């Protein structure tokens, strides 16, 4: 039973370790999606301007 | 080799990690390895009830459970590949054991398998000069010794 408990705690610690990089990547993706949206909007605004 | 273990442990095959986590590599000799490999799912109850087999497994530091038997077989086969302890002599021993266990599957797998780098005499010289270095260190630190 002690072995099982230690395995659980090891899994917890591994999760805590990996979440550093994981959360940073997710933040990066947030910003990426936002800037992709803004780029699309820039293109559409340019082409709306073109047809004035 | 999960297909092999499916062949020889048809329904009783367990969720197990295919690698030799063997901690000694000299835990058992080749005849004992052949006996452990000949514990095919059709002989396993008889083997576990055999007093001699229980003695053997206690000598090797095994249980007589299904899972430990399969894990030991995995480790034996990976040593057969990586540390390369067995020869066709292991196949000899399995052919000898075929008196009891007609274990053709593991026999063929051991036969038809890329064996490994062999490396014997270089390893011999390495170990011998390791022991020479240890002897020199002991000499450093008494005259009788």
């Amino acid at each position: 039973f002690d072995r099982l408990l230690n395995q659980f705690q090891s899994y917890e610690k591994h999760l805590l370790l990996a979440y550093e990089n994981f959360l940073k990547e997710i933040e990066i993706l947030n910003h990426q999606i936002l800037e992709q949206l803004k780029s699309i909007s820039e293109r559409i605004s340019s082409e709306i301007f073109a047809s004035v | 080799m999960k297909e092999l273990f499916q062949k020889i442990w048809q329904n009783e095959l367990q969720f197990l990690n295919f690698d030799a986590k063997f901690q000694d590599k000299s835990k058992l000799d080749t005849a004992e390895c052949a006996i452990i490999l000949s514990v095919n799912k059709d002989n396993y109850e008889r083997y576990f009830l055999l007093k001699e087999f229980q003695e053997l497994c206690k000598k090797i530091d095994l249980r007589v459970d299904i899972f430990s038997m399969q894990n030991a077989q995995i480790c034996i086969l990976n040593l057969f590949k990586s540390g390369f302890i067995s020869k066709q002599d292991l196949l000899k021993a399995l052919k000898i054991l075929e008196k009891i266990s007609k274990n053709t599957e593991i026999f063929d797998f051991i036969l038809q398998e890329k064996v490994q780098s062999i490396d014997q005499k270089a390893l011999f010289q390495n170990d011998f000069k390791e022991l020479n270095t240890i002897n020199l260190e002991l000499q450093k630190l008494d005259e009788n010794l």
Binding site: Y11, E12, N30, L34, S41, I48 | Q14, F15, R63, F67
Partner: protein, 197 residues
């Protein structure tokens, strides 16, 4: 191409969560495999004890694994729904955003025209209008102010930690059971060893 990039990113996040679950799963199933079959060595070792241990470790999938899987499934569902929202409001309705903002600017232009008293579009205004049409205030809030993906991940981590704690307590029950027997044995031993009295 942008949409496909984001889709692949979402799949990547889902795969990471799944991989965490798979790690834990493999460990737990190896435990089950070993101790569903552990057999007693020599007589006097309480066959019933070992039998009960084997049964418990056999059901240890139920005991230790399926809750984590359910949590993973919930997180995957939330991720998929968020991606669907982003797709259907932004990366598919760009045509509709174009038409709406374009017609709006046309009507504004004609409104300017109809001032025939001699008494028109800037690009920044067009950009802001297209941004609003693409729902970029809403997605700004969901991506920066209240990050949805980040919240999903943190929920996964926190709930998995709570699950681990629950499992720990559950196993402590078994250990207390063992402690009872152990204390009984120690009482007997101390009684035997202190009978020179």
């Amino acid at each position: 191409k942008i949409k496909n990039e984001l889709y692949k990113s979402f799949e990547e996040i889902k795969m990471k969560l799944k991989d965490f679950i798979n790690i834990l799963e493999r460990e737990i199933l190896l435990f089950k495999a070993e101790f569903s079959n552990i057999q007693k060595d020599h007589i006097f070792q309480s066959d019933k004890n070992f039998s009960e241990l084997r049964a418990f470790c056999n059901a240890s999938d139920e005991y230790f694994l399926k809750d984590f899987k359910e949590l993973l499934f919930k997180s995957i569902l939330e991720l998929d729904l968020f991606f669907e929202k982003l797709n259907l409001k932004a990366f598919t309705n760009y045509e509709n955003a174009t038409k709406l903002s374009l017609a709006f600017f046309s009507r504004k232009i004609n409104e300017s025209r109809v001032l025939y008293e001699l008494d028109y579009p800037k690009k920044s205004e067009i950009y802001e209008r297209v941004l609003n049409e693409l729902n970029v205030y809403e997605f700004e809030t969901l991506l920066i102010n209240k990050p949805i993906l980040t919240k999903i991940a943190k929920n996964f981590l926190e709930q998995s930690q709570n699950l681990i704690q629950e499992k720990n307590k559950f196993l402590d029950l078994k250990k207390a059971e063992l402690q009872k027997r152990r204390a009984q044995i120690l009482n007997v031993r101390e009684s035997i060893k202190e009978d020179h009295h």
